[PDB]
């Protein structure tokens, strides 16, 4: 929902931090499904804010967030 922060870096830093979200999901189950990462718990709140902040990206997109 609200950010500031995470619409508020600019629009290189803003791709650098949400692309990190939105590849970290996708990396941290990778882990798990070799067999590295193992707190579930990070990956499951990881999600929430993925959620949020590959959001963020897509409200930038169309016109959502200026």
Do not use: H, P, V
């Not at 929902?1 to 970290?24: F, G, P």
């Not at 709140?45 to 902040?53: Q, S």
């Amino acid at each position: 929902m609200k950010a500031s922060e995470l619409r508020n870096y600019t629009d290189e830093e803003l791709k650098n931090l949400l692309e990190e979200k939105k590849r970290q999901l996708m990396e941290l189950r990778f882990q798990l499904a070799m067999g590295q990462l193992k707190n579930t718990s990070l990956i499951k709140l990881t999600k929430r804010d993925i959620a949020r902040i590959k959001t963020i990206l897509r409200e930038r997109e169309l016109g959502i967030r200026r």
